[PDB]
């Protein structure tokens, strides 16, 4: 599993997009995919969610529709939303 600093690093190329939309850089989607790909266990998924939530809290003006739709744009299903207030502790 990725550590939280690793998950944050994977998300840096997403920041502008996550605020404003427009061009979704492929390096962003590569990072989202990396997170999902490393999330093998249920705890891994809860932990990734909790890191992403903190990550989202730290992006001033993050748009929660863009964040919700980002994994699907990247061909990723993560079974929670990236948001500053997700209940991560119930993820399966």
UniProtKB/Swiss-Prot annotation:
It comes from Corylus avellana. Belongs to the plant LTP family. GO terms for biological process: lipid transport; seed development. GO terms for molecular function: lipid binding; nutrient reservoir activity. Expressed in seed (at protein level). Expressed in seed. Resistant to heat. At room temperature no effect in protein secondary structure by varying pH. This is Non-specific lipid-transfer protein Cor a 8.0101. Stable at low pH. Refolds at pH 2.5 after thermal denaturation. Thermal denaturation is irreversible at pH 7.5. In order to protect patients that are allergic to hazelnuts, it is extremely important to find ways to detect trace amounts of hazelnut in foods that should not contain it for the food labeling and safety purposes. This protein is used in the development of these methods. For the detection of hazelnut, a liquid chromatography tandem mass spectrometry (LC-MS/MS) method in selected reaction monitoring (SRM) mode is developed by using a selected marker peptide from this protein as standard. Monomer.
């Amino acid at each position: 599993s990725l550590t939280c600093p690793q998950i944050k690093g994977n998300l840096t190329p997403c920041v502008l997009y996550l605020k404003n939309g427009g061009v979704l850089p492929p390096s962003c989607c590569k990072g989202v995919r990396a997170v999902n790909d490393a999330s093998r266990t249920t705890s891994d998924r809860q932990s990734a969610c909790n890191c992403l939530k903190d990550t989202a809290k730290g992006i001033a003006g993050l748009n929660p529709n863009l964040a919700a739709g980002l994994p699907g744009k990247c061909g990723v299903n993560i079974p929670y939303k990236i948001s500053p207030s997700t209940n991560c502790n119930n993820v399966k």
